[PDB]
Amino acid sequence: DPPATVYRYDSRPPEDVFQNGFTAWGNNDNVLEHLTGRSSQVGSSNSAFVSTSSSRRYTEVYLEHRMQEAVEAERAGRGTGHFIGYIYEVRADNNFYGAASSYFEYVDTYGDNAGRILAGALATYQSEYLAHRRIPPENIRRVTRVYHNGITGETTTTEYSNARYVSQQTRANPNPYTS
Ligand SMILES: CN(C)CC(=O)Nc1ccc2[nH]c(=O)c3ccccc3c2c1
DSSP states (O other), rough: OOOOOOEEESSOOOOHHHHHHHEEESBOHHHHHHHHHEETTTTOOOOOOEEEEHHHHHHHHHHHHHHHHHHHHHHHTTSSEEEEEEEEEEEETTTEEEEEHHHHHHHHHHSSOOOOOHHHHHHHHEEEEEEEEEEEEEEEEEEEEEEEETTTTOOOEEEEOOTTOOOOOOOOOOOOOOO
């Protein structure tokens, strides 16, 4: 039963995301390259997928890693220590494809003699959903803004809804992504 709702941590604020949605980095729709990172590398940032998770908690884990990175950067003199991260709640539709399922389909076709995802990561990927090319702003319901002052340790959480959100009865695609 594919999720009707997924979540995405992003550093981009709602003035950007609620107007533009999320857009992928390039036109490379190779699922294995997205999941392993080949299509996310500097000099190689061309994936056609926008990642989301059906687990809000997992997006909070992502946010909290980035928060700690900002705290550590300030301690080292490479940042202000003022971190802002955002968790977006997104309506999934047939343009959203399960990562684990898409991986298994990729392997069934091309094998794994070379590119192989470890079991621990693949288990996380059961909750990862890949939106092809973009997530329109009409799919984005609301945002949670998390501010953290690295120097004082103080945090706030604030909520805003997206006026452009369009309600529809959709859920993620039940099938793997195929190129
Ligand atoms: C590290 N950058 C080159 C790429 C990047 O920032 N990716 C990115 C950026 C934001 C992301 N946000 C998520 O919620 C998420 C959830 C599951 C898997 C990945 C993500 C996610 C990934």
